[PDB]
Amino acid sequence: HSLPLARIKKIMKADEDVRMISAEAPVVFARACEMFILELTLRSWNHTEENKRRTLQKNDIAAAVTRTDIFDFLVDIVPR
Amino acid sequence: HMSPREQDRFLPIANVSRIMKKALPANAKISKDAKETMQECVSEFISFVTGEASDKCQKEKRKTINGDDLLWAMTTLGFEDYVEPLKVYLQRFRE
């Protein structure tokens, strides 16, 4: 697992409200981000299998976002 | 999004693509626009969760977001399945 911890902090602190960040917080976030990518990729893949195709495309993510409530926050940026 | 400034709002597309591939069968392929869309989803995920963690510690008059706030935020926003394995991970840092 090797997501860059410095990039993650930059993204967290893009929010002006955020002030200081603990030492372990970005590490933990890296792990969570990984599980998020896995689950979203895999859910999208099943829409790819069902369309019988072999390339995961943007529309496959748009469909996945609409099927799962935990991904409902993404409909503002990946509209179907 | 080719500027260094623009690129700095996202995790690198190479680190994201490697992870995406781990969840797919070896024969699977991923278009370019799918990798970029995944890039934006991850930054949105980081801002979403941080937004809730930030709110909690502000209500508690604390200035530092830590690992406990983050997992609380993930429970609050519905990511319960990530929370169990992460709790054990974050416990390794405190003990």
mmCIF file of C-alpha atoms in Angstrom:
data_model
loop_
_atom_site.group_PDB
_atom_site.id
_atom_site.type_symbol
_atom_site.label_atom_id
_atom_site.label_comp_id
_atom_site.label_asym_id
_atom_site.label_seq_id
_atom_site.Cartn_x
_atom_site.Cartn_y
_atom_site.Cartn_z
ATOM 1 C CA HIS A 1 0.000 0.000 0.000
ATOM 2 C CA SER A 2 1.752 3.212 -1.065
ATOM 3 C CA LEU A 3 -0.470 6.236 -1.559
ATOM 4 C CA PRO A 4 1.546 9.383 -0.943
ATOM 5 C CA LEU A 5 0.850 10.769 2.507
ATOM 6 C CA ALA A 6 1.950 14.278 1.526
ATOM 7 C CA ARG A 7 -0.567 14.453 -1.318
ATOM 8 C CA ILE A 8 -3.307 13.351 1.026
ATOM 9 C CA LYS A 9 -2.555 16.095 3.498
ATOM 10 C CA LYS A 10 -2.668 18.684 0.761
ATOM 11 C CA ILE A 11 -6.084 17.512 -0.231
ATOM 12 C CA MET A 12 -7.307 17.482 3.376
ATOM 13 C CA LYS A 13 -5.989 21.001 3.990
ATOM 14 C CA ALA A 14 -7.551 22.381 0.807
ATOM 15 C CA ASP A 15 -10.426 22.916 3.261
ATOM 16 C CA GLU A 16 -9.700 26.245 5.000
ATOM 17 C CA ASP A 17 -11.489 24.978 8.078
ATOM 18 C CA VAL A 18 -8.848 22.363 8.632
ATOM 19 C CA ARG A 19 -5.982 23.495 10.778
ATOM 20 C CA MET A 20 -3.650 20.842 12.076
ATOM 21 C CA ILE A 21 -3.531 17.182 11.251
ATOM 22 C CA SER A 22 -2.336 14.362 13.501
ATOM 23 C CA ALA A 23 0.606 12.191 12.586
ATOM 24 C CA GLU A 24 -1.344 9.036 12.006
ATOM 25 C CA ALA A 25 -4.361 10.545 10.328
ATOM 26 C CA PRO A 26 -3.031 10.604 6.750
ATOM 27 C CA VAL A 27 -1.720 7.049 7.105
ATOM 28 C CA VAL A 28 -5.152 5.851 8.116
ATOM 29 C CA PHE A 29 -6.682 7.830 5.340
ATOM 30 C CA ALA A 30 -4.420 6.119 2.853
ATOM 31 C CA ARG A 31 -5.805 2.782 3.879
ATOM 32 C CA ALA A 32 -9.369 3.986 3.648
ATOM 33 C CA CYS A 33 -8.784 5.447 0.215
ATOM 34 C CA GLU A 34 -7.507 2.131 -1.003
ATOM 35 C CA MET A 35 -10.581 0.260 0.176
ATOM 36 C CA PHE A 36 -12.732 2.966 -1.419
ATOM 37 C CA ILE A 37 -11.027 2.535 -4.801
ATOM 38 C CA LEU A 38 -11.333 -1.254 -4.605
ATOM 39 C CA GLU A 39 -15.050 -1.270 -3.779
ATOM 40 C CA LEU A 40 -15.973 1.406 -6.333
ATOM 41 C CA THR A 41 -13.873 -0.267 -9.049
ATOM 42 C CA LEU A 42 -15.357 -3.675 -8.393
ATOM 43 C CA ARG A 43 -18.913 -2.430 -8.299
ATOM 44 C CA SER A 44 -18.321 -0.679 -11.585
ATOM 45 C CA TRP A 45 -16.768 -3.800 -13.003
ATOM 46 C CA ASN A 46 -19.981 -5.762 -12.458
ATOM 47 C CA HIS A 47 -21.819 -3.260 -14.642
ATOM 48 C CA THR A 48 -19.073 -3.888 -17.209
ATOM 49 C CA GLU A 49 -19.571 -7.665 -17.015
ATOM 50 C CA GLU A 50 -23.345 -7.248 -17.350
ATOM 51 C CA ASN A 51 -22.882 -5.121 -20.481
ATOM 52 C CA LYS A 52 -20.626 -8.018 -21.668
ATOM 53 C CA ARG A 53 -17.788 -5.547 -22.412
ATOM 54 C CA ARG A 54 -14.170 -5.775 -21.240
ATOM 55 C CA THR A 55 -13.146 -2.111 -20.801
ATOM 56 C CA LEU A 56 -14.119 -0.296 -17.620
ATOM 57 C CA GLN A 57 -15.420 3.050 -18.903
ATOM 58 C CA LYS A 58 -16.645 6.256 -17.291
ATOM 59 C CA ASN A 59 -20.309 5.306 -17.720
ATOM 60 C CA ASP A 60 -19.596 2.141 -15.706
ATOM 61 C CA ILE A 61 -18.663 4.355 -12.750
ATOM 62 C CA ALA A 62 -21.716 6.571 -13.287
ATOM 63 C CA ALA A 63 -23.905 3.468 -13.044
ATOM 64 C CA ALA A 64 -22.166 2.211 -9.954
ATOM 65 C CA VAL A 65 -22.641 5.474 -8.153
ATOM 66 C CA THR A 66 -26.395 5.324 -8.659
ATOM 67 C CA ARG A 67 -26.781 1.747 -7.385
ATOM 68 C CA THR A 68 -25.114 2.155 -3.957
ATOM 69 C CA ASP A 69 -26.226 4.631 -1.298
ATOM 70 C CA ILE A 70 -22.741 5.091 0.201
ATOM 71 C CA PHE A 71 -21.668 6.498 -3.187
ATOM 72 C CA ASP A 72 -24.625 8.899 -3.415
ATOM 73 C CA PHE A 73 -22.353 11.826 -2.544
ATOM 74 C CA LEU A 74 -20.598 11.343 -5.905
ATOM 75 C CA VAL A 75 -23.603 12.048 -8.137
ATOM 76 C CA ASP A 76 -22.756 15.766 -8.141
ATOM 77 C CA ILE A 77 -19.508 15.120 -10.030
ATOM 78 C CA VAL A 78 -20.191 11.878 -11.915
ATOM 79 C CA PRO A 79 -23.717 12.301 -13.217
ATOM 80 C CA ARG A 80 -25.274 9.398 -15.059
ATOM 81 C CA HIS B 1 -5.679 18.988 -15.965
ATOM 82 C CA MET B 2 -1.996 19.198 -16.858
ATOM 83 C CA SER B 3 -0.679 21.922 -14.560
ATOM 84 C CA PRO B 4 1.206 20.975 -11.426
ATOM 85 C CA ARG B 5 -1.299 23.054 -9.532
ATOM 86 C CA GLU B 6 -4.211 21.200 -10.972
ATOM 87 C CA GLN B 7 -2.528 17.884 -10.523
ATOM 88 C CA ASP B 8 -1.933 18.595 -6.855
ATOM 89 C CA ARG B 9 -5.675 18.350 -6.125
ATOM 90 C CA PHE B 10 -5.591 14.606 -6.875
ATOM 91 C CA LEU B 11 -3.692 11.450 -6.107
ATOM 92 C CA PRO B 12 -1.335 10.572 -8.987
ATOM 93 C CA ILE B 13 -3.062 8.651 -11.758
ATOM 94 C CA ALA B 14 -0.401 5.931 -11.607
ATOM 95 C CA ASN B 15 -0.961 5.178 -7.908
ATOM 96 C CA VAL B 16 -4.720 5.124 -8.527
ATOM 97 C CA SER B 17 -4.508 2.843 -11.571
ATOM 98 C CA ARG B 18 -2.417 0.259 -9.798
ATOM 99 C CA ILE B 19 -5.008 0.009 -7.105
ATOM 100 C CA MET B 20 -7.850 -0.226 -9.514
ATOM 101 C CA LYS B 21 -6.207 -3.117 -11.227
ATOM 102 C CA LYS B 22 -5.814 -5.059 -8.045
ATOM 103 C CA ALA B 23 -9.578 -5.408 -7.838
ATOM 104 C CA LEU B 24 -10.052 -6.553 -11.436
ATOM 105 C CA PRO B 25 -9.288 -9.866 -13.172
ATOM 106 C CA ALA B 26 -5.938 -10.006 -14.948
ATOM 107 C CA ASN B 27 -7.595 -9.726 -18.372
ATOM 108 C CA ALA B 28 -9.510 -6.546 -17.496
ATOM 109 C CA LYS B 29 -8.597 -3.148 -18.937
ATOM 110 C CA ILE B 30 -9.523 0.400 -17.914
ATOM 111 C CA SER B 31 -10.064 3.366 -20.224
ATOM 112 C CA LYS B 32 -8.255 6.642 -19.599
ATOM 113 C CA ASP B 33 -11.366 8.629 -18.655
ATOM 114 C CA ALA B 34 -12.264 5.971 -16.087
ATOM 115 C CA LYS B 35 -8.907 6.490 -14.364
ATOM 116 C CA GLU B 36 -9.469 10.258 -14.248
ATOM 117 C CA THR B 37 -13.037 9.916 -12.976
ATOM 118 C CA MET B 38 -11.709 7.622 -10.247
ATOM 119 C CA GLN B 39 -9.113 10.304 -9.468
ATOM 120 C CA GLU B 40 -11.850 12.871 -8.848
ATOM 121 C CA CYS B 41 -13.945 10.439 -6.788
ATOM 122 C CA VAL B 42 -11.012 9.838 -4.430
ATOM 123 C CA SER B 43 -10.403 13.546 -3.848
ATOM 124 C CA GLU B 44 -14.138 13.992 -3.340
ATOM 125 C CA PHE B 45 -14.069 11.123 -0.846
ATOM 126 C CA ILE B 46 -11.187 12.757 1.024
ATOM 127 C CA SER B 47 -13.001 16.109 1.186
ATOM 128 C CA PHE B 48 -16.322 14.529 2.194
ATOM 129 C CA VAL B 49 -14.866 12.606 5.117
ATOM 130 C CA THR B 50 -12.601 15.432 6.206
ATOM 131 C CA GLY B 51 -15.544 17.773 6.212
ATOM 132 C CA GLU B 52 -17.262 15.634 8.854
ATOM 133 C CA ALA B 53 -14.157 15.025 10.917
ATOM 134 C CA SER B 54 -13.434 18.699 10.875
ATOM 135 C CA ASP B 55 -16.897 19.541 12.082
ATOM 136 C CA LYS B 56 -16.676 17.147 14.989
ATOM 137 C CA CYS B 57 -13.401 18.466 16.380
ATOM 138 C CA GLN B 58 -14.563 22.034 15.890
ATOM 139 C CA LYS B 59 -17.595 21.317 18.031
ATOM 140 C CA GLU B 60 -15.213 19.807 20.604
ATOM 141 C CA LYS B 61 -13.044 22.970 20.380
ATOM 142 C CA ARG B 62 -10.032 20.993 19.206
ATOM 143 C CA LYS B 63 -7.614 22.161 16.563
ATOM 144 C CA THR B 64 -6.278 18.837 15.381
ATOM 145 C CA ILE B 65 -7.931 16.250 13.228
ATOM 146 C CA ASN B 66 -6.743 12.790 14.254
ATOM 147 C CA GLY B 67 -7.441 9.176 13.358
ATOM 148 C CA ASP B 68 -10.362 8.784 15.780
ATOM 149 C CA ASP B 69 -12.235 11.715 14.234
ATOM 150 C CA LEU B 70 -11.718 10.247 10.762
ATOM 151 C CA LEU B 71 -13.241 6.860 11.589
ATOM 152 C CA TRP B 72 -16.091 8.452 13.515
ATOM 153 C CA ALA B 73 -16.746 10.513 10.385
ATOM 154 C CA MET B 74 -16.703 7.344 8.291
ATOM 155 C CA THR B 75 -19.262 5.683 10.550
ATOM 156 C CA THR B 76 -21.432 8.812 10.458
ATOM 157 C CA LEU B 77 -21.310 8.938 6.643
ATOM 158 C CA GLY B 78 -21.991 5.254 6.191
ATOM 159 C CA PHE B 79 -18.665 3.615 5.599
ATOM 160 C CA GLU B 80 -19.082 1.029 8.349
ATOM 161 C CA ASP B 81 -17.414 -1.758 6.477
ATOM 162 C CA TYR B 82 -14.112 0.140 6.300
ATOM 163 C CA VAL B 83 -14.220 0.934 9.945
ATOM 164 C CA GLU B 84 -13.597 -2.476 11.417
ATOM 165 C CA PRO B 85 -10.221 -3.169 9.786
ATOM 166 C CA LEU B 86 -9.155 0.417 10.164
ATOM 167 C CA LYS B 87 -9.921 0.411 13.874
ATOM 168 C CA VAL B 88 -7.451 -2.372 14.436
ATOM 169 C CA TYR B 89 -4.934 -0.543 12.297
ATOM 170 C CA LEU B 90 -5.258 2.724 14.140
ATOM 171 C CA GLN B 91 -5.117 0.850 17.445
ATOM 172 C CA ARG B 92 -1.633 -0.347 16.476
ATOM 173 C CA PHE B 93 -0.472 3.255 16.565
ATOM 174 C CA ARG B 94 -1.774 3.881 20.030
ATOM 175 C CA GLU B 95 -0.640 0.662 21.617
#
